Design a protein around this nucleic acid. Structure first.
Length: 191
RNA sequence: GCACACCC
């Protein structure tokens, strides 16, 4: 080594084994609403984390050009139901999406870069039928974010019921897509 | 009166 005058450092406070196998997605709410979504000193938003039993966080602008702040929901689908159900209700609170309109709030879910291409389907038919099952608007971009992050986003537009069902289904195929690592069809499939 | 927090 080399003894540098007061040039000694380290600081390694990264302990504990917290299993991050909870579903974590980014809920798209523009800066015009995100503020009041947190609510009063940010107390009841953390209270929400308690009664939902999930990790409710507000993501700082992932891009400096964002007019929106995404809610980082880390929780089981049981909790996500309340969390996102009430988050869409916060849209209703100020009626940003539309006064008479039913809730139309975008949710952004992070999928592996190639997995977004495969949610379209191995034949390309799957993305169309996904919309038919999810009851939501699933738009899969060819760009979104460079594969430098090996991960992109699909945008879900519609009602929270639809969004919640869409999110979990696309997030669900991700695991099955990654199963390609096995590489070896030691069995059949009806496809 | 509406926002800020979310970990050590």
């Amino acid at each position: 080594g080399a003894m540098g005058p007061s040039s000694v450092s380290g600081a390694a406070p990264f302990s504990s084994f917290m299993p991050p196998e909870q579903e974590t997605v980014h809920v798209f709410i523009p800066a015009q609403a995100v503020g009041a979504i947190i609510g009063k000193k940010g107390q009841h938003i953390k209270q929400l984390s308690r009664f939902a039993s999930a990790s409710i966080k507000i993501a700082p602008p992932e891009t400096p050009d964002s007019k929106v702040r995404m809610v980082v929901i880390t929780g089981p689908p049981e909790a996500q139901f309340k969390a996102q159900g009430r988050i869409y209700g916060k849209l209703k609170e100020e009626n940003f999406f539309g006064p008479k309109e039913e809730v139309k709030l975008e949710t952004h879910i992070r999928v592996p870069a190639s997995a977004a291409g495969r949610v379209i389907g191995d034949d390309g038919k799957t993305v169309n039928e996904l919309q038919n099952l999810t009851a939501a608007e699933v738009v899969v971009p060819r760009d979104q974010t460079p594969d430098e992050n090996e991960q992109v986003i699909v945008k879900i537009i519609g009602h929270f019921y639809a969004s919640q069902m869409a999110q979990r289904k696309i997030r669900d195929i991700l695991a099955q897509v990654k199963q390609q690592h096995q590489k070896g069809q030691s069995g059949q499939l009806q496809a």
